[PDB]
Amino acid sequence: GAPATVTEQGEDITSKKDRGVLKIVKRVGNGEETPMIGDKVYVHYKGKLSNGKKFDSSHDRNEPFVFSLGKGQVIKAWDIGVATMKKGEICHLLCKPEYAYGSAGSLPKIPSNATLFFEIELLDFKGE
Numbered sequence: 862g863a864p865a866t867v868t869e870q871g872e873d874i875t876s877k878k879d880r881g882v883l884k885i886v887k888r889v890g891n892g893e894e895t896p897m898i899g900d901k902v903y904v905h906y907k908g909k910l911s912n913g914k915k916f917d918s919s920h921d922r923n924e925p926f927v928f929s930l931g932k933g934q935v936i937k938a939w940d941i942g943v944a945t946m947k948k949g950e951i952c953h954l955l956c957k958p959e960y961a962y963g964s965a966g967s968l969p970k971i972p973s974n975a976t977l978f979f980e981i982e983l984l985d986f987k988g989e
């Protein structure tokens with residue numbers, strides 16, 4: 862399924878080249894521009910654990926998740942991955958724990974040492 866496919870066929874988008882964050886573009890976005898550091902970004906997402914369980918979805922809340930890009934307001938894999946996206950893009954990201962919640966996890970949804978799968982849609986980005 863999709864997690865296996867991004868694991869086996871994804872693009873390493875880390876600067877270190879450590880395969881910590883792998884990406885597949887699933888729906889091509891608009892033009893060429895990507896957000897810049899500090900932009901307000903609006904996304905929709907779904908997350909799955911490596912045991913198959915769906916741990917979260919913003920769609921189910923009928924509201925996007927909004928944060929300021931490149932500020933550490935999200936796990937590393939999201940700052941890195943969202944920065945690569947065009948407006949209207951949908952991607953899959955596979956996130957090793959060093960770019961996610963590490964050995965601590967996140968109580969209660971995320972165990973220790975968890976590799977995470979996300980589907981992310983970049984709805985919009987705005988300078989403030």
Ligand SMILES: C=CC[C@@H]1/C=C(\C)C[C@H](C)C[C@H](OC)[C@H]2O[C@@](O)(C(=O)C(=O)N3CCCC[C@H]3C(=O)O[C@H](/C(C)=C/[C@@H]3CC[C@@H](O)[C@H](OC)C3)[C@H](C)[C@@H](O)CC1=O)[C@H](C)C[C@@H]2OC
Binds near residue numbers: 906908962
């Ligand atoms: C504290 C008050 C609650 C506050 C909760 C909200 C605003 C509601 C908001 C929709 C979050 C979700 O609530 C439904 C829920 O989203 C997940 O399910 C999820 O999909 C996820 O992975 N996300 C969310 C989307 C952005 C990426 C990532 C994240 O980076 O999330 C961030 C995260 C957990 C960062 C930790 C913070 C501690 C550091 O030590 C650790 O460092 C490695 C990283 C979120 C946004 C936090 O900044 C803010 C909060 O936590 C988490 C699995 C658990 C999280 O609920 C807790």
